[PDB]
Symmetry: D2
Subunit: 380 residues, 4 copies
């Protein structure tokens, strides 16, 4: 009656995550001066290069060189010895205004509450009572392992560490009436970029004793836990030099780690009129509100939109059998309590605030009491 | 006892799909001369620009200008009036060899069968008996609507059509003992790029009569079906001019349309040593083999890997209650019948063959009897 | 006692000249809002691509997409059939602020009159009484042949013409006491981009009858004049698709066509603190003032600078024996009448005015009564 | 009876010279495998970026990443502390085949001796007996000052030096019957990039004692010589980070330092069919042959071409009055002794040999006994 499930996470210096952070740094910079900026900023990273590509219509005056370079500095890529340096990399910009055809279809001449969805699409929200963060344990652990790497790099404990890292956690679970109950960590993978001087045994020892043991509750570890620590044997070349980065290339890391579902919409570099972002945030908020309200233990919420249309086209609720209420009753509760138009979500979740760079590593969900992580008290 | 579910698809000229097709055109070109080419080719598209970024180690001599431009020609972007032209766009290349640290960790000096996974990661396979293609109806319909658009453009029936299109289908379902049974199409969205001369009513009439009616079985349509046809009102600007494209930005379109799950791994531009591609293909093959073998009606398969390690770290099977066999029994059957090392999958699925461009629109699954769509006869 | 001399010119759509015009369009846009903008804008052109590279510190808010695209529209590249289209090309920007090390060395905290030269360098000015424009006949004719091409393209007389063109004129001269006296046109070359429909004989006939005969005074043409008209035989591919363009790649076309001398400094995309521009303009002004003042018939002026130093390091005057005054006397006259500090030249020549795009085809000298073409009355 | 004249030179790490060296490295790499490669490679450099733009048709298999990066390594940009690093910069490639319209006009189906000029244009050759190298003293000194900088950097004498440098020398001359006779160095400018630790007085002292005194014969220096050493006061930011680089942006540095004349044709990145290179080299060879043959002391040679035509359109010889022979007699001698078709020059000067990178700093003329610097014995 047990099953395995695996999730992964990446660190701040993973090339895809560099792009997500830069795109959201660019978005925040616009929003700081123009709360109504229309932003759709993709970032591409390869050896020595940050390229911004996409569409921005805004009143803000933004110094892209500064914004990009400060983001890469925060990540820690500050010397050619590390494979990338904010001081001396190439920053190229291919940014145009938003298509006027889109603008006229979505928001021009509309009352804010009634703005159309910025695109079509489908979005899911998920919550699970298995952790206090209402998130899968597999992904929560994976994220914390990367955060611990960054901490130890930054505080000088493990000065051989670089910014690019990946982690993966397999948990063995049992189920109870459709809820899931973690039993033990089955397998942990950690790969992290490193300097030329440190040997593999020192790294593997440090990853076990200073990272894994510092993060994973000991009740979940036993003698049969499998560790794959620096399994490649060598990871000196890293960041964009080792592997190309794109914005929106970590959508599963950003969300639920393989649990629930995903509609395909990336978050980073988009203002609230992009329902890929605002409706996914709202959907998480719905799902979390249902669980923390005691109406279910686990729940998946789907919504979907058409470009130019303000109201969702479909809402669906799946409770995995973890409620005494029917799924149709939960749907009636959601419909009574939430207004999932983007022009209303923006007010409920304060989505014109320039806090997006903070979302762009370690997952958008399950941390920091962002507005979509504060449950709505439900009337029913 | 009914529920709604929504999936989307995009056409060949959607800017993300242009990138996926180009990346796979580049991969095929390498594989045509060097079956063992190591390829990790991302493509970025914006107004007038195709950029290739990533890592390729190969013996092939490839003319990137020709390969890229022929792919964009096939898609149909051949004049500045359409917003993009293969004859005159910019093709920029930022391609390096594969990192030697990766190469030494994964494949150098290894027997082919025992090559390590090209990366860590998690991958799901899904199959459902609701259609002959073993795919969700929502996504199958969405894909066929885009294919019909392309057909009508190409044959000159609707010469006002351009290549960039999106579709979305919401089906109303009932469930039966964990299987799903489609009842009716609830909502259809179609947005498609068009010329400056055609009016909106002509387009909406054509989308209803020549596209939707030609594709959706009439038993699924009724008087309450909701149509959102060119809901933006105007879509003259399109392709990379309207919206930036990236490779791997359509991973849900490429797979199961929101059903099942996704581990986050994009397919296009990667050779078989990238388990994001090979293991996802194998997982689909497993799932399809279970359903077509009559062991379940619906099934989700997870596998996961570590870089440099040949065997999967975890396998999990979820049958939604649609089998008399336990999930653990299905897992024992999968373990008996499949070898999910990448160096074995490559032989079973013939993944050195240059057929990848064909996968890169209209979904990787549910069509054309690709090798991963031919069920394995199971011993148990 | 005769000699041949050859000069060339290029048209507005020659890829190097596209870059010069774009760089000066960018400069003008800055100067329109911030008269003290520091601008060093290089432009690179290839198939489908305009890249801006360089350094700009300015208070202006400039829409590079608009500025670039409007410049390419003015040139006439507006359809993929012509090989380039302002509507749909890629505009990439790699622009940073001026180096603070340069800024502190040249202008920060300085009184305007005493700003240092923006760089080291040498610059020449030249004037010759052989034409009313005080320019060599060879280059004046070459420029007018390109201007006539553009006129006939624009007015629809020769609608098969495209924007990319080159011309070259060889004149046979005699000398008189160091002045030069044109006798006849020896050879004319014209190459111009064209459509796919027009045949070579129609083009060659039109180039002779509608272009050459319309431009070159008939006294200079005879039966032995050699014509090389579309000598390549085919010129359908042109503009940046046929040949890469760079700013500052037409410095001889921009100046004296091989006569006099050149110190190596390009003009386009630079504000007045760049002495490559301001001192060359001043030097032309000196040379023209000497000739129109009747102090010589032909004259070459050299000046040179060091970065951060306001006054020139060297001034030299060479009159080819065409004055009764010694060269040292002409030098004393120049020193009495001109102040060749950049912070003074800017006032004399009004070099903060946004008129630079107009300079960037058909030569910077010998036309339009620009301020450096209005002779200073000399005191001596 | 004296006059001043100024020339400049730049060092190997000047951003324009980086581009010239890279373009010629790319050319050499092609020529190493395919002696008939058609190459027209421009290079653009800015912070963190090397872009190759242009046209190459060749049978060679060239690894642009290696070729570019090895060239930047040779120059000395190997750490982010220096502002640029060959290990980690971005190398972008926008290279297409040669235009088929050009190819058919110039060389396809032609006997090699009779290939047409690769373009129209004018080119000058110059030689002067004032130095053993037959070059102006002003430019020879400027080049040697940069070479001494590189030597002292490379051998560790002045380890605070970086690769980017500029120099400028003003010589006071007298004339003798049209020959020029250097008397003294009037002014020297040196600007060189440096580390953050060295103070200005140490630099200025070293530039005087270790560079200028090591290079300039003491007979040319006196107490009135003016020195402008690090005149900006600070030059820590340098290379492509301080200033954009382009190929062909140092054409006066590459040739005669302001003496003689220039037709506008850049050398680097072009195979011999580009007469900008081959005919300029031949013209230098003619001029040097005239002087070393004792037919004049100083001489300027002009030639010019039309695209597709093998023979020059015009030849002109100007001896400044430094011969007893008339200019027309020298012209008859040149015509008797030289064949200035590009398909013949290639044989005389061995221009398919991959030695071009060596030409791309410190001037193309006056050094190393390149074939165009070995005088032809003249028959007359
Ligand atoms: N040598 C290596 N060993 C393990 N992981 C690596 C290595 N190089 C890169 N990676 C990580 O895996 C991803 C894909 O190659 C990169 O973004 C990086 O985070
Ligand atoms: N004006 C429009 N109306 C509807 N869809 C559009 C429009 N412009 C672009 N799109 C589609 O939506 C996506 C996101 O803007 C694009 O890739 C494109 O396919
Ligand atoms: N086929 C051709 N015939 C003549 N001139 C050309 C041709 N193609 C390009 N050119 C011109 O010559 C230059 C160098 O190839 C280009 O900028 C262009 O102006
Ligand atoms: N701070 C400086 N001082 C002097 N010369 C410089 C400085 N920065 C750059 N340069 C040189 O002058 C050129 C133009 O700015 C550059 O290529 C570089 O060689
Ligand atoms: K990648
Ligand atoms: K996008
Ligand atoms: K060129
Ligand atoms: K520059
Ligand atoms: Mg990735
Ligand atoms: Mg989407
Ligand atoms: Mg997209
Ligand atoms: Mg992955
Ligand atoms: Mg040119
Ligand atoms: Mg200069
Ligand atoms: Mg320069
Ligand atoms: Mg030329």
């Amino acid at each position: 009656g047990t099953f395995l499930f695996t999730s992964e996470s990446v660190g701040e210096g993973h090339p895809d995550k560099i792009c997500d952070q830069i795109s959201d740094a660019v978005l925040d910079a616009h929003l700081q001066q123009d709360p109504d900026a229309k932003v759709a900023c993709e970032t591409v990273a390869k050896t020595g290069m940050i390229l911004l590509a996409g569409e921005i219509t805004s009143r803000a005056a933004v110094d892209y060189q500064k914004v990009v370079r400060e983001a890469v500095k925060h990540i820690g890529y500050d010397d050619s010895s590390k494979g990338f340096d904010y001081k001396t990399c190439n920053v190229l910009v291919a940014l145009e205004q938003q298509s006027p055809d889109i603008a006229q279809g979505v928001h021009l001449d509309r009352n804010e509450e009634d703005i159309g969805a910025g695109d079509q699409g489908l979005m899911f929200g998920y919550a699970t009572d298995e952790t206090e963060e209402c998130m899968p344990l597999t992904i929560v652990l994976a994220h914390k392992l990367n955060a611990k790497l960054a901490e130890l790099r930054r505080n000088g404990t493990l000065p051989w560490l670089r910014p690019d890292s990946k982690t993966q956690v397999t948990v063995q679970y049992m189920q109870d009436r459709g809820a899931v109950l973690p039993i033990r960590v089955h397998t942990i993978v950690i790969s992290v970029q490193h300097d030329e001087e440190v040997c593999l045994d020192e790294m593997r020892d440090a990853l076990k004793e200073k990272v894994i043991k510092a993060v994973v509750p000991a009740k979940y570890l036993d003698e049969d836990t499998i560790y794959h620590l620096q399994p490649s044997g060598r990871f000196v070349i890293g960041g964009p030099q080792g592997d190309a980065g794109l914005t929106g290339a970590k959508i599963i890391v950003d969300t639920y780690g393989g649990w629930g579902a995903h509609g395909g919409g990336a978050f980073s570099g988009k203002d609230y009129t992009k329902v890929d972002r605002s409706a996914a945030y709202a959907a998480r908020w719905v799902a979390k509100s249902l669980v923390k309200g005691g109406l279910c233990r686990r729940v998946l919420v789907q919504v979907s939109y058409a470009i130019g249309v303000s109201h969702p086209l479909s809402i669906s609720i799946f409770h995995y059998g973890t409620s005494q209420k029917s799924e149709r009753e939960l749907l009636e509760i959601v419909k009574k309590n939430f207004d999932l138009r983007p022009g209303v979500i923006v007010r409920d979740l304060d989505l014109k605030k320039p806090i997006y760079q903070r979302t762009a590593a370690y997952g958008h969900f399950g941390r920091d009491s962002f507005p979509w992580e504060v449950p709505k008290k439900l009337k029913y």
